[PDB]
Design an enzyme around this catalytic site. Sequence first.
Site, PDB file in Angstrom:
ATOM      1  N   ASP B   8     129.513  46.970 102.978  1.00 30.10           N
ATOM      2  CA  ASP B   8     129.930  48.122 103.753  1.00 30.10           C
ATOM      3  C   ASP B   8     128.848  48.255 104.859  1.00 30.10           C
ATOM      4  OD1 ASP B   8     131.122  50.586 104.588  1.00 30.10           O
ATOM      5  OD2 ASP B   8     129.901  51.741 103.153  1.00 30.10           O
ATOM      6  N   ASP B  10     127.863  51.630 106.877  1.00 30.45           N
ATOM      7  CA  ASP B  10     127.115  52.882 106.740  1.00 30.45           C
ATOM      8  C   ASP B  10     126.617  53.058 105.300  1.00 30.45           C
ATOM      9  OD1 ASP B  10     126.444  55.351 108.511  1.00 30.45           O
ATOM     10  OD2 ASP B  10     127.263  56.258 106.696  1.00 30.45           O
ATOM     11  N   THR B 122     134.307  47.735 107.004  1.00 28.61           N
ATOM     12  CA  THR B 122     133.886  49.078 107.391  1.00 28.61           C
ATOM     13  C   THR B 122     134.980  50.002 107.908  1.00 28.61           C
ATOM     14  OG1 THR B 122     132.223  50.304 108.718  1.00 28.61           O
ATOM     15  CG2 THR B 122     132.978  48.191 109.640  1.00 28.61           C
ATOM     16  N   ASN B 123     134.838  51.304 107.598  1.00 30.51           N
ATOM     17  CA  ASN B 123     135.671  52.384 108.121  1.00 30.51           C
ATOM     18  C   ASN B 123     134.934  52.817 109.365  1.00 30.51           C
ATOM     19  OD1 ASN B 123     137.634  52.454 106.126  1.00 30.51           O
ATOM     20  ND2 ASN B 123     136.996  54.381 105.200  1.00 30.51           N
ATOM     21  N   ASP B 184     128.412  52.311  99.280  1.00 34.73           N
ATOM     22  CA  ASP B 184     127.658  53.503  98.875  1.00 34.73           C
ATOM     23  C   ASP B 184     128.598  54.662  98.448  1.00 34.73           C
ATOM     24  OD1 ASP B 184     128.405  53.796 101.614  1.00 34.73           O
ATOM     25  OD2 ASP B 184     126.812  55.261 101.963  1.00 34.73           O
ATOM     26  N   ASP B 334     103.560  22.337 126.404  1.00 33.24           N
ATOM     27  CA  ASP B 334     103.205  20.942 126.694  1.00 33.24           C
ATOM     28  C   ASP B 334     103.464  20.646 128.184  1.00 33.24           C
ATOM     29  OD1 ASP B 334     102.392  18.141 125.428  1.00 33.24           O
ATOM     30  OD2 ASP B 334     104.273  17.736 126.465  1.00 33.24           O
ATOM     31  N   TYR B 382      96.762   8.015 124.495  1.00 33.88           N
ATOM     32  CA  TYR B 382      98.209   7.849 124.474  1.00 33.88           C
ATOM     33  C   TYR B 382      98.838   7.958 125.915  1.00 33.88           C
ATOM     34  CZ  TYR B 382      99.151  12.876 125.024  1.00 33.88           C
ATOM     35  OH  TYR B 382      99.231  14.163 125.508  1.00 33.88           O
ATOM     36  N   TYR B 465     104.493  11.692 132.935  1.00 34.22           N
ATOM     37  CA  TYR B 465     103.106  11.220 132.763  1.00 34.22           C
ATOM     38  C   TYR B 465     102.684  10.186 133.795  1.00 34.22           C
ATOM     39  CZ  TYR B 465     103.300  12.982 127.886  1.00 34.22           C
ATOM     40  OH  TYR B 465     103.435  13.761 126.772  1.00 34.22           O
ATOM     41  N   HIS B 523     100.768  20.856 117.244  1.00 37.68           N
ATOM     42  CA  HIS B 523     101.325  20.658 118.574  1.00 37.68           C
ATOM     43  C   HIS B 523     102.712  21.289 118.808  1.00 37.68           C
ATOM     44  CE1 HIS B 523     101.841  19.042 122.523  1.00 37.68           C
ATOM     45  NE2 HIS B 523     103.043  18.607 122.161  1.00 37.68           N
TER      46      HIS B 523
HETATM   47  C1  LIG Z   1      97.722  14.210 115.359  1.00 33.45           C
HETATM   48  C2  LIG Z   1      98.902  13.886 116.290  1.00 33.45           C
HETATM   49  C3  LIG Z   1      99.745  15.130 116.603  1.00 33.45           C
HETATM   50  C4  LIG Z   1      99.742  15.444 118.087  1.00 33.45           C
HETATM   51  C5  LIG Z   1     100.474  14.685 118.997  1.00 33.45           C
HETATM   52  C6  LIG Z   1     100.473  15.010 120.386  1.00 33.45           C
HETATM   53  C7  LIG Z   1     101.248  14.229 121.443  1.00 33.45           C
HETATM   54  C8  LIG Z   1     101.585  12.769 121.026  1.00 33.45           C
HETATM   55  C9  LIG Z   1     102.607  12.041 121.935  1.00 33.45           C
HETATM   56  C10 LIG Z   1     103.803  12.940 122.320  1.00 33.45           C
HETATM   57  C11 LIG Z   1     103.303  14.244 122.962  1.00 33.45           C
HETATM   58  C12 LIG Z   1     102.486  15.024 121.914  1.00 33.45           C
HETATM   59  C13 LIG Z   1      99.735  16.086 120.791  1.00 33.45           C
HETATM   60  N1  LIG Z   1      99.011  16.829 119.902  1.00 33.45           N
HETATM   61  C14 LIG Z   1      98.991  16.548 118.574  1.00 33.45           C
HETATM   62  O1  LIG Z   1      98.332  17.256 117.815  1.00 33.45           O
END
Ligand SMILES: CCCc1cc(C2CCCCC2)c[nH]c1=O
Lengths: 546, 546
Positions: B8, B10, B122-123, B184, B334, B382, B465, B523
Amino acid sequence: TLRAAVFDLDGVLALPAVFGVLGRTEEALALPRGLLNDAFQKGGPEGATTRLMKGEITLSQWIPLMEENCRKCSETAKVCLPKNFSIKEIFDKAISARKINRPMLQAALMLRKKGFTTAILTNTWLDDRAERDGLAQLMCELKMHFDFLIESCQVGMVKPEPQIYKFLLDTLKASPSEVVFLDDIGANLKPARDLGMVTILVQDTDTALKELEKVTGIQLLNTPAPLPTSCNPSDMSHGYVTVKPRVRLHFVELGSGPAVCLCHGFPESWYSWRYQIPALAQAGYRVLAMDMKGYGESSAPPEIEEYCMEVLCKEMVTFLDKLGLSQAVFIGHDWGGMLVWYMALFYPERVRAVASLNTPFIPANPNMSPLESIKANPVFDYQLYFQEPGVAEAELEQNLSRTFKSLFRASDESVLSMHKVCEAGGLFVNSPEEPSLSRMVTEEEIQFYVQQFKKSGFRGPLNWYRNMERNWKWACKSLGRKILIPALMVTAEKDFVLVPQMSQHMEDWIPHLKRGHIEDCGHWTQMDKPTEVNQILIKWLDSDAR
Amino acid sequence: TLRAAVFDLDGVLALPAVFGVLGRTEEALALPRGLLNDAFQKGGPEGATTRLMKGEITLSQWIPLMEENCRKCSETAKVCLPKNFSIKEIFDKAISARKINRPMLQAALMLRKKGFTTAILTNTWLDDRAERDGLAQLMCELKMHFDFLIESCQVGMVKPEPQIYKFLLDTLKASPSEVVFLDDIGANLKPARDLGMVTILVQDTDTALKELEKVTGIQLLNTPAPLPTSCNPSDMSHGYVTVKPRVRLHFVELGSGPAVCLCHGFPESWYSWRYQIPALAQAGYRVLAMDMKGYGESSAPPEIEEYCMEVLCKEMVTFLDKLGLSQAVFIGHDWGGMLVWYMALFYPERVRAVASLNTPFIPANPNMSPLESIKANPVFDYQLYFQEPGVAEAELEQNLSRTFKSLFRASDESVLSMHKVCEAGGLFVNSPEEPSLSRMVTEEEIQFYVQQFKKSGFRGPLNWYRNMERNWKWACKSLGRKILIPALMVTAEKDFVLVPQMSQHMEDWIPHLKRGHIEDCGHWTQMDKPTEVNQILIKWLDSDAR
Ligand SMILES: CCCc1cc(C2CCCCC2)c[nH]c1=O
Ligand SMILES: CCCc1cc(C2CCCCC2)c[nH]c1=O
Ligand SMILES: CCCc1cc(C2CCCCC2)c[nH]c1=O
Ligand SMILES: CCCc1cc(C2CCCCC2)c[nH]c1=O
């Protein structure tokens, strides 16, 4: 021979000029003449104003440097600046008081319509003031009417430096002799002239436009009233919502503010609101222009029942639910007008306000029925012709271009003999094979409708008329209710089916009803009288829909 | 065996009950006990309240009939109602004070998660009050968590009439013995019980939930903290904007209010904000969750330069221009976080406020460069691996499911040895072939990312990147500026690349900077700690973004 027109912003496309405020503030505060203008330009190309204009610093960083220049200038002049002296306050006011110079914008629009490449070339700053949104809105409204917007702070160059002029010509892809350049600052015209461009020193707009038409050979002054801004389908934000497994609804979206859901009639499109969309977004509203079920990019199921008012209304509620909207103002025309009244009757919590163009609020007669009522009035004969599945579809789908050219006509231009559609066996039995183009539409606008109807045709759209007994039963449940939410009824003088007198009893059901009325306006309200439709809707929205 | 739960509204899903206000008003105004409750139910099934509940009349039509019943009741009781007595005022307050019973909603959510079909029975009335939006919002938030919403005023039937119970069972497609019904009002439980349904008379929530878990065998009380509402991709409004001839941008849209543009990082989706979208829309914002250039339904051109920050920012400005938005708050994570800071630096007029998750504001070093800086810190190795076109693409595209399962892990669960990605020749050279499912994600959420990356892969995303020298040159133009618009920096404790200490100098560039910080957060901020992200963003939005 000219093919490009360039406009400055301050003192040309926007008035009053910010430079004229510095002078007005000196006179008001009885300060030495030109003191504020001199602190503003202090150090010429090396100074704080040049760094601001080039994008080196933001407006908030510039404010304290202008104060220090103002102090330095007052000291040398052996004078004292007042107690409540604040550069921020002066500039806040100046920017807020600055409005679009509408006749200058129209001339730019007329030049662009005749094939000219148009541009705004301006010395401007990166505005980070708490009140920056005002200017952000002005630049938004303005920029969309031009091919290019060139801002000093974004290009790192400034007028009157020769580099910005060479940058302009490159952007335009035009030689100097093919360019008209309009500026209110003589010093800024000088390099354009030196390069061989046609220049206009803009003092008063009228004189500037007289020079502009003399040099281009295009009428810009004393021109007939222009139509509102229309829409280019490919420049809109297109939205898609699944309201149920086999039904997706398409819409076009523009603006921020309270949500305004536009509902077209038969056999139309979201594009029927093309002249309302930019106008309502500019007036401070979030416009949602629908492709109703059976149309354009919206799904078109084949089953008649899928187009009854109960199903159509439930789907519009789901549409709101999926977008996360608790309400919207609902504005309808023709079949969309019928739906909006029923949205107000059955879901008043979800309807902020309701407005209808041409379509009056039609309450069910529990004693009669819609079939009996439709037979009683010969103007509604075409609805009986629409009853038998397949018949109207064959005529309407035979030649799409002929269909929309025959339908989309003003009251005078009409080719349809509405009285005996059934007897004569069709709506176009007396219409030409190649109808002329109505004064309301271009060839391109007709072709957009043609391409739209190629996907599903007229089955789904015609089914909206094939639910009379179903709608009547559903409507009878609302016979004890009243519409007490804000409501607007707009009548059209020359609509021969949805006649203004048909709305005469609406106050019995809607006591607080507001009205609008358009003289010399046929069935296709939005494109027949766009300027007046916009004026009526904006006025009612600002007073009754917040 | 139970498979359906009915609630219900209310006194069950919403508290305090409106019936309890009538009693509170009698006591406050020292009126005879039960006078207001008796005028309310006057004439039982024939009375004004039944007509209202069945949808015969609207709330505004009912108000005067309730006043007349109140007068009749006071006359018989030989008493006088006070001078400032107004039914409207009483009901306006009662409706506004009524809030969602959060523990009852969680139990309904837990039941639905375990396979139960859930419904609200419900009413209720057709609300046409000037203040109807409050209730419209409550019904909106509530209804989306249930399979069915059954409202008396919409079905023309009322509790305790046996017809509504038969209608309920039909809607649920369940026999009475498979249904738990919570109410109720004892009188309203009676017909459900008579039919053979399990009934619960709801007084206090705790006792009601104890009965509910005892009868269903599902833990509803003392349950761990639930995650926020997520998104079902197929139930969202999807928007598409062309920003230039070969570039279209896709987004998901929810809510009304100031525009909030969400910008994901690498290699993500709009869906990375799935836990923020319903929350920010509920908090009074219009959410625009982007598919950034190179991702999902957004275009993915192959050229590196198409992904430099200048081009990406210009396209986001055009995106605003085409939607008719003068501003939006920009929230990034990010790579999206890097873009939002640059949106604040280059277009402060278009940015209402700026917030970044993990990504600090990185100002260009005109003496060094990003390449040199990236080499100096081994955690950024990376990014060097991402440089050579094709290499990272081959590893990331080899097995999509393995890619997202290896990447989308909490700080503890991680399988990546970030320090030597180049040397070891890949990010997954030490990751299993079949990674386990992280505690943060389901199999289904991983599969949505897999399907998304099938369209364009990792070229466009990796190109973000590959613009270091281009971004550095562009960023150097902003070396004299400051960010002076409202700004939020959110650090994540356990992010091993975008470490909190990297943001320590941000106040030099952003003096009015506000901060947020999340403990035990890796992350993938949005899915790691959704509840805390939502709390930080909503608090900052309501205080700094209006
Ligand atoms: C320990 C790995 C985890 C991690 C990866 C990344 C990156 C890795 C590649 C893709 C973009 C995020 C950033 N920060 C982190 O803690
Ligand atoms: C709720 C009324 C149903 C209905 C009315 C009409 C007409 C009836 C004559 C007046 C204008 C509307 C056409 N089609 C319908 O389904
Ligand atoms: C004189 C004919 C113009 C006209 C047509 C219609 C209908 C005809 C069939 C499609 C729907 C509009 C309504 N009102 C009018 O004035
Ligand atoms: C404007 C800076 C350009 C840039 C920086 C980074 C890194 C540099 C090291 C600190 C974090 C950002 C990666 N890619 C880029 O294009």
